[PDB]
Amino acid sequence: MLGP
Amino acid sequence: MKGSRIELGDVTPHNIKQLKRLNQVIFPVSYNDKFYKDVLEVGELAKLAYFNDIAVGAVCCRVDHSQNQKRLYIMTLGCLAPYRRLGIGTKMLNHVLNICEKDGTFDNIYLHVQISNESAIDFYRKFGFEIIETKKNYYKRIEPADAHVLQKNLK
Ligand SMILES: CC(C)(COP(=O)(O)OP(=O)(O)OC[C@H]1O[C@@H](n2cnc3c(N)ncnc32)[C@H](O)[C@@H]1OP(=O)(O)O)[C@@H](O)C(=O)NCCC(=O)NCCS
């Protein structure tokens, strides 16, 4: 889960 | 392979709306009109997942040249709570492992996880990913802010  | 209720499908302008709608319920961070614009160009690397012809999941990836390596970065990969532990996530991951395997040119694949995400670690570890780093305060505004980095080697 990227961000960011 | 046969009698399975789960199928993946291409993401298209016609259904992107629904990908967006699924990423919002599953993931705590929100993604911008760029992320989604980008997925329409990545091909097989963005897929919706259906259970009995219902969209309950999705995965979105990207190719990364970082560290002087060719890398597959998984940005999102999840499925609505009620449909978990049915093998849906496995379908999405394997699909991605297959692409990499045929292409032959990837050094590794990887992704970030909130350290509190115990189930995602059980999941990714089953496939051979290892925790290789723990970045502090990676995420901006959620709790907890820390993230493991997970990675499986291909080369
Ligand atoms: C992680 C996630 C994608 C799992 O997907 P799923 O479709 O439920 O996973 P599967 O049904 O394919 O599970 C495969 C195996 O992973 C392991 N596993 C997955 N969740 C587990 C859990 N909560 N506890 C123990 N083992 C687990 C199990 O060994 C499981 O096999 P089993 O069901 O036969 O025991 C899902 O829980 C999710 O949507 N999480 C939120 C999204 C997220 O944070 N994703 C991280 C990638 S960015």
XYZ file of all heavy atoms in Angstrom, chain B residues 6 35 74 83 88 128 130:
60
model
N -14.063 -17.507 -8.927
C -13.260 -16.297 -9.036
C -12.596 -16.116 -10.400
O -11.926 -17.014 -10.902
C -12.153 -16.285 -7.971
C -12.733 -16.623 -6.599
C -11.457 -14.937 -7.942
C -11.687 -16.824 -5.534
N -2.991 8.399 -10.095
C -2.924 6.962 -9.831
C -3.824 6.193 -10.798
O -3.363 5.290 -11.500
C -3.330 6.698 -8.372
C -3.410 5.235 -7.993
C -2.291 4.553 -7.565
C -4.616 4.561 -8.020
C -2.366 3.220 -7.205
C -4.693 3.235 -7.657
C -3.564 2.565 -7.246
N 3.997 -3.403 -6.188
C 2.578 -3.578 -5.927
C 2.072 -2.392 -5.129
O 2.470 -2.190 -3.990
C 2.329 -4.857 -5.104
C 2.814 -6.107 -5.868
C 0.853 -4.983 -4.710
C 2.680 -7.448 -5.074
N -15.359 -11.131 1.898
C -14.926 -12.127 0.913
C -13.487 -12.625 1.112
O -12.940 -13.309 0.241
C -15.084 -11.574 -0.503
C -16.507 -11.171 -0.820
C -16.926 -9.870 -0.652
C -17.426 -12.097 -1.287
C -18.217 -9.492 -0.935
C -18.729 -11.732 -1.569
C -19.116 -10.418 -1.390
O -20.405 -10.017 -1.669
N -9.115 -15.333 -3.115
C -9.161 -14.245 -4.083
C -7.835 -13.499 -4.218
O -7.352 -13.252 -5.326
C -10.285 -13.256 -3.734
C -11.633 -13.873 -4.112
C -10.062 -11.922 -4.433
C -12.806 -12.996 -3.798
N 6.602 -16.226 -0.077
C 8.053 -16.131 -0.079
C 8.632 -14.733 0.039
O 9.843 -14.557 -0.089
N 9.929 -11.585 2.165
C 10.472 -11.350 3.519
C 10.462 -9.863 3.862
O 10.613 -9.023 2.978
C 11.922 -11.832 3.659
C 12.262 -13.208 3.123
C 13.718 -13.290 2.616
O 14.541 -12.394 2.958
O 14.033 -14.249 1.865
